[PDB]
Design a protein around this ligand. Structure first.
Ligand SMILES: *[C@@H]1O[C@H](CO)[C@@H](O[C@@H]2O[C@H](CO)[C@@H](O)[C@H](O)[C@H]2NC(C)=O)[C@H](O)[C@H]1NC(C)=O
Ligand SMILES: *[C@@H]1O[C@H](CO)[C@@H](O)[C@H](O)[C@H]1NC(C)=O
Lengths: 51, 51
C-alpha cells in the first residue's frame, strides 16, 4: 500500500514510492487478484496486463 | 509472518491478515522454499499446491 501505480507514455504500468519519485516496472508478483472490481479502477485487457 | 495461512471450503489455500479478516488467494510468490519440514505442517501433494 506504500506504492503508487501509474502509466507511462507507452501505456506500460509503473510503480513508485511516495517518499521519492523512483519509478519501476510493475510485474505480476506485485499484485493481488480479487473477485470484484471498482468504478475507480482502470480498464484493461489481458494483452495490456503486467508481464 | 504477518499473514495466517488456512484452507477454504474447496480445500484451496488462503492468506489473511490478523488485524482484519480479509482473505485472499495464496500464490507461489508468497512462499519461501526450505529443505526441512516440521510436524505441524499440512501434508500436500504437488497437484494441490497454490498456483
Ligand atoms: C505428514 O506426512 C508424514 C509422512 O507420512 C507424517 O509423518 C509420519 O507420522 C507418523 C505418525 O502419524 C509416523 O509414524 C511416521 O513415522 C511419520 N513418517 C515420517 C516419514 O516421518 C506426518 O505425521 C504427517 N503430518 C500430518 C499433520 O498429517
Ligand atoms: C470501465 O468500464 C466500465 C464498464 O464495464 C465503465 O463503467 C467504466 O467507466 C470504465 N472505466 C474506465 C476508467 O474507463
Amino acid at each position: 500500500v506504500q506504492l503508487t501505480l501509474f502509466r507511462n507514455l507507452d501505456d506500460k504500468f509503473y510503480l513508485t514510492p511516495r517518499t521519492m519519485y523512483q519509478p519501476r516496472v510493475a510485474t505480476i508478483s506485485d499484485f493481488v487478484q480479487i473477485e470484484g472490481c471498482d468504478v475507480l479502477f482502470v480498464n484493461a485487457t489481458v494483452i495490456e496486463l503486467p508481464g
